[PDB]
Design a protein around this ligand. Structure first.
Ligand SMILES: Cc1nc([C@H](CN)NC(=O)c2ccc(-c3ccc(Cl)c(F)c3)[nH]2)sc1CO
Ligand SMILES: *[C@@H]1O[C@H](CO)[C@@H](O)[C@H](O)[C@H]1NC(C)=O
Ligand SMILES: *[C@@H]1O[C@H](CO)[C@@H](O)[C@H](O)[C@H]1NC(C)=O
Ligand SMILES: *[C@@H]1O[C@H](CO)[C@@H](O)[C@H](O)[C@H]1NC(C)=O
Ligand SMILES: *[C@@H]1O[C@H](CO)[C@@H](O)[C@H](O)[C@H]1NC(C)=O
Ligand SMILES: *[C@@H]1O[C@H](CO)[C@@H](O)[C@H](O)[C@H]1NC(C)=O
Ligand SMILES: *[C@@H]1O[C@H](CO)[C@@H](O)[C@H](O)[C@H]1NC(C)=O
Ligand SMILES: *[C@@H]1O[C@H](CO)[C@@H](O)[C@H](O)[C@H]1NC(C)=O
Ligand SMILES: *[C@@H]1O[C@H](CO)[C@@H](O)[C@H](O)[C@H]1NC(C)=O
Ligand SMILES: *[C@@H]1O[C@H](CO)[C@@H](O)[C@H](O)[C@H]1NC(C)=O
Ligand SMILES: *[C@@H]1O[C@H](CO)[C@@H](O)[C@H](O)[C@H]1NC(C)=O
Ligand SMILES: *[C@@H]1O[C@H](CO)[C@@H](O)[C@H](O)[C@H]1NC(C)=O
Length: 340
């Protein structure tokens, strides 16, 4: 017998003690090795309630990732609460690795295996595991990168769809590659991302039809963000230690829902609003040579316009900015229980 409970998790990973890559360094000193033959027990006739939007595992992953960035990616100047801090901002080796989250003795993780589980409510096919799957701590806005794919249909996740102030996580069932490059050869901060337009527009059409199921068949419209800070009006992510900010207007145009490569204009930014919430920071300028990251788009963060109740349209804009939602998109199926 068991009950919902919180406890300090530990982490496991396959980090390498000889790598200078910062995720490897961090996990070498903060995690243990992975279990080569992990155990999973499928519980028959067990129904468990889950709530991805109130899951202490998300807060613990946030603290790990804040910890890793604080030790790994130091800016030159840190503008934190009225004080200036100027330190060394050396260039680093940066490429996220999967991190497993694990329960100590007396606790277990219950895992929801319902194929179209939305992250809230009862789950019929539950298993018990000691550790989650490996989760890469990818910090980004607008688009979720390099995550897991939904196994059956596209899933819409929200703490409350009727509340337009709550973020929507769209969980894709098919990857769309995004290929971002600061060319070796000029403007050292100019970059771009290439996306296969046929794939993207097919997936976005499928996202439209899913949202229709949730909004009583109203007309589904995508628009670019209206206001907000740069981090949210742009698709922002970290590639090899450099901060990329990309204009996604071409992705969220309802015209094609147009085969061909979509080229998004991007810029590498040194001056950053810190997702940790600690103010602004300036990092070092870009390394020389070709800077490139090819990622899987596996999810989308959306905000829905208010004030459309008296029309047949619902308008959705790419959003995000609460990085905890990034960890929720991978942790939604897990909860910790204590074993009696
Ligand atoms: C109350 C509060 N206000 C905050 C500010 C508002 N200005 N938000 C940020 O600073 C911010 C959000 C995301 C990012 C970011 C930066 C770089 C990259 Cl690559 C990236 F993917 C994401 N920054 S945070 C916070 C605490 O939750
Ligand atoms: C739960 O498992 C049964 C048997 O494998 C399957 O028929 C059913 O579709 C599953 N439910 C979900 C939500 O995946
Ligand atoms: C990207 O997606 C492909 C297929 O969707 C998958 O085989 C590959 O492992 C993914 N890479 C990631 C998630 O880093
Ligand atoms: C993805 O889900 C949609 C329904 O949301 C479905 O029509 C489509 O077949 C799925 N695609 C794949 C590749 O499973
Ligand atoms: C998720 O499923 C639960 C249970 O079926 C339901 O109460 C809730 O409205 C659903 N939420 C979303 C966002 O689909
Ligand atoms: C969800 O949000 C709507 C609109 O803001 C509100 O009327 C409703 O009570 C909320 N539902 C819950 C369960 O809080
Ligand atoms: C990404 O685009 C560059 C050109 O900008 C190309 O050289 C490279 O092969 C592409 N990578 C993939 C995986 O398509
Ligand atoms: C882009 O996606 C389409 C969709 O299947 C595919 O056929 C094509 O090979 C991809 N690459 C292109 C168009 O360069
Ligand atoms: C949308 O329309 C279809 C008719 O094609 C209907 O069967 C379905 O119930 C409608 N869904 C909603 C959410 O109104
Ligand atoms: C993105 O590009 C479009 C078209 O080039 C432009 O109108 C828009 O202002 C850009 N967005 C931002 C946030 O700069
Ligand atoms: C996604 O995974 C690929 C393959 O490991 C990696 O090269 C790329 O840099 C990752 N993207 C991000 C944004 O971390
Ligand atoms: C919009 O609709 C929601 C849910 O139907 C409702 O709770 C809210 O009061 C409406 N807003 C306005 C401004 O009428």
């Amino acid at each position: 017998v068991w009950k919902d409970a919180d406890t300090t998790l530990f982490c496991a990973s396959d980090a390498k003690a000889h790598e200078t890559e910062v995720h490897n360094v961090w996990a070498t000193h903060a995690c243990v090795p992975t279990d080569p033959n992990p155990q999973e027990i499928h519980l028959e006739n067990v129904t468990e309630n889950f709530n991805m939007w109130k899951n202490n595992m998300v807060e613990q992953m946030q603290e790990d990732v804040i910890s890793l960035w604080d030790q790994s990616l130091q800016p030159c100047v840190k503008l934190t609460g009225g004080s200036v801090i100027k330190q060394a901002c050396p260039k680093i080796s940066f490429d996220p690795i999967p991190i497993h989250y694990c329960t100590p003795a007396g606790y277990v993780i219950l895992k929801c295996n319902d194929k179209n589980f939305n992250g809230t409510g009862p789950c019929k096919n539950v298993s018990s595991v000691q550790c989650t799957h490996g989760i890469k701590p990818v910090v980004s806005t607008q688009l979720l990168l390099n995550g897991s794919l939904a196994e059956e249909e596209i899933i819409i996740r929200s703490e409350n769809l009727t509340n337009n102030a709550k973020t929507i996580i769209v969980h894709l069932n098919k990857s769309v590659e995004i290929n971002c490059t600061r060319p070796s050869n000029g403007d050292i901060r100019k970059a771009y991302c290439e996306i296969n337009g046929t794939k993207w527009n097919k997936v976005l059409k499928q996202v439209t039809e899913k949202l229709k199921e949730h909004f009583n068949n109203k007309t589904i419209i995508f628009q670019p963000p209206s206001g907000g800070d740069l981090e949210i009006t742009m698709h922002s992510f970290n590639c090899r230690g450099e901060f990329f900010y990309c204009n996604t207007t071409q992705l969220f145009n309802n015209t094609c829902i147009c085969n061909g490569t979509i080229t998004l204009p991007c810029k590498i930014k040194q001056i950053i609003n810190m997702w940790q919430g600690t103010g602004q920071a300036m990092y070092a300028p870009p390394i020389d040579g070709k800077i490139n990251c090819v990622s899987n788009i596996t999810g989308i963060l959306l905000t829905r316009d208010g004030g459309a109740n008296n029309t047949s349209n619902e308008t959705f804009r790419p959003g995000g900015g609460n990085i905890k939602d990034n960890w929720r998109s991978e942790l939604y199926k897990y909860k910790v229980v204590q074993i009696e």
